Amino acid sequence: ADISREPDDVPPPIGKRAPQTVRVDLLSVELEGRLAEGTTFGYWTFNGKVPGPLLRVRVGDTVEIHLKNAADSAMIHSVDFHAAIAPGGGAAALQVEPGGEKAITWKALVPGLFVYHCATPMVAEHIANGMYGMILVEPEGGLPPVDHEFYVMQGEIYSDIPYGQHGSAEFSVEKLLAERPEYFVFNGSVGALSKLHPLKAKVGDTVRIFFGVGGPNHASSFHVIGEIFDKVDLFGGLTTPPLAGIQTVTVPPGGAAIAEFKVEVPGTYTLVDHALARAERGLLGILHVQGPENPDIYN
């Protein structure tokens, strides 16, 4: 029923541990999920949620990825890692028929936040139906610790029925090619980070949002309303020193961003793409901040 992935669904950080072999088990499932209130959609998912599970490795880690396809699936599924140096991002040999299972190993060489998605023809459809996720490759030593870590991805829903219409919705190839989505969604559904799973922090907390755009067509202008990003890893790269003091960051489709900020004032904060007509199409996130008032910063 609930396809929305929780933002707080984040693996524990890698410490100062040495490189190792890491096993990953991803299962591609097609299920009917809640897109909006009264509206259901035919989702293609990794592990039954949109986006797919956030993965967390170190540089030098050999990732042993297993991809199983559910028996009741109607489509061939794969996975393309942006962290991988492999033909098709390793999806060349991960074309899995419903029922079967394939496995490859790849080594992470570049630190940063990378997008993963299904790379089965047609790729734009598989992504749009919700088959996208992120893989974080932490550098040697790891990221400096913060109080809160969140996992947010932007996606497009190309439903045949118009926005506002209740009932069963299927993918529209016409809208896809026209690049005209009916719904813009954070983490799968409408109000996934609003009514369903609102982000929560306390006054004085440093928040790190692992943001990425599944797409598959439109770029995002990521902005937390009421906050300025202290540090931004542009395109989600953890090699070049980050940008400092940014209001809005351009995140391309298949791209990432590591946005860090300190919360100083209590209240409600809004996660939006600053193409704010999309906020009327479900692209709205809520960050509740509880604590004492800070009159020196805001009165």
Instruction: Write out the residues near Yb ion by the rule CB under 5 A.
Output: 55-56, 87, 92, 267-268
Out of Cl ion, a copy of itself, Y ion, none, which partner does residue 47 contact, by CB within 5 to 8 A per kind? Cl ion
With binding defined as CB under 5 A, does residue 282 bind Cu ion? no
Binding to Er ion, residues 168-207 (CB under 5 A): 170-171
Distance CA 196, CA 189 (A): 9
The verdict on whether residue 126 carries a ligand-binding annotation is: yes
Q: Which stretch binds Cl ion (CB under 5 A): 47-55, 179-187, 225-233, 282-290?
A: 47-55
With binding defined as CB under 8 A, does residue 255 bind a copy of itself? yes
Range 26-63 burial, b when 16+ CB lie within 10 A, else e:
bbbbbbebbbbeebbbbbbbbebbbbbbbbbbbbebeb
Distance CA 259, CA 25 (A): 28
Interacting residue with Er ion among 13, 42, 267, 291 (CB under 5 A): 42
With binding defined as CB under 8 A, does residue 191 bind a copy of itself? no
Nearest CB to a copy of itself, comparing residues 1 and 18: 18
Q: Which residue is nearest to Tb ion (CB)?
A: 147
Distance CA 242, CA 145 (A): 16
Q: Which stretch binds Cu ion (CB under 5 A): 55-63, 118-126, 207-215, 233-241?
A: 118-126
Angle at 156 between CA 155 and CA 157, to 5 degrees: 125
The verdict on whether residue 80 carries a ligand-binding annotation is: yes
Contact assessment for residue 237 and residue 229, using Cβ atoms and an 8 Å cutoff: no
- Interacting residues with Cu ion (CB under 5 A): 77, 118, 120, 126, 131, 254
- Interacting residues with Y ion (CB under 5 A): 11
